[PDB]
Amino acid sequence: SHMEVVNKGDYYSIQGKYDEIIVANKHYPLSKDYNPGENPTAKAELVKLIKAMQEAGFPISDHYSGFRSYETQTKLYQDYVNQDGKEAADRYSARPGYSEHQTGLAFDVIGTDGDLVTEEKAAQWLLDHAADYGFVVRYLKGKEKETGYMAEEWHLRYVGKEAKEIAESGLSLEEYYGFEGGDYV
């Protein structure tokens, strides 16, 4: 079953159960020019999700950290490095050409905040119902050695129909699909 990854040029991808699954992480970088914008299918699903969360009573904004280009990433990374250094920045912020946001398939929900109890309720809601809309929480709790990054409640990755199966496993995409993760080089 373990399928090896296929280079499409600008990006690597692996053939999922129903769809082609683009792979972007510290081990699998994207090209510099790759500037797709946001995915219109994923975009339409996130919008539905946000309304479900808002109508559920959670303070969730109408805007989100969706697509980020290489260029945007270059300026975003170095600022976080300035803030905490390089060893601490690398734990939650990808280098230019390694960010899932560059694919157009990854979006960070914004909460506006901040009751804490309300945040964690919202974070659990995602875990329980993000698959319904083809999304998965990418950077799960206690999976930093596999994914490369520490846990992040708000970063969703559109995978589509297989989101439910992936969530039920409790695995990272690296573990589930069996492609490499970890650190750089």
Binding site: N25, S93, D108, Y139, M150, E152, E153, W154
Partner: peptide
């Protein structure tokens, strides 16, 4: 922290 925490964006990857």
């Amino acid at each position: 922290a925490x964006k990857x």
